[PDB]
Amino acid sequence: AKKVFKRLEKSFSKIQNDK
């Protein structure tokens, strides 16, 4: 149930590309 991290990782994932 505490895996919303995925959605959060999705928002931060964009930053990983523009590092």
List the main descriptive attributes of the protein structure presented here.
mainly alpha; 19 residues
Task: Explain how this protein is built.
Part of the 50S ribosomal subunit. It comes from Helicobacter pylori (strain J99 / ATCC 700824). Binds directly to 23S rRNA. The L1 stalk is quite mobile in the ribosome, and is involved in E site tRNA release. Protein L1 is also a translational repressor protein, it controls the translation of the L11 operon by binding to its mRNA. By secondary structure, this protein is mostly helical. Helix content is 68%, strand content 0%. It is built from 1 helix and no strands. The chain has one helix at 5-17. It starts with a helix and ends with a helix.
Q: Tell me roughly what share of residues is in helical segments.
A: 55-70%
Helix and strand string, N-terminal first? H
Radius of gyration: 9 Å
> What is the tally of helical segments?
1
Structural class by secondary-structure content? mainly alpha
- Shape category: rod-shaped
Instruction: Write down how many β-strands occur, each being a DSSP E stretch of 2 or more residues.
Output: 0
Specify the biggest β-sheet.
none
- As a percent range, the share of strand residues is under 5%
How widely separated are the two ends?
Answer: 30 Å
Function: Binds directly to 23S rRNA. The L1 stalk is quite mobile in the ribosome, and is involved in E site tRNA release.
Family: Belongs to the universal ribosomal protein uL1 family.
Protein name: Large ribosomal subunit protein uL1
Subunit structure: Part of the 50S ribosomal subunit.
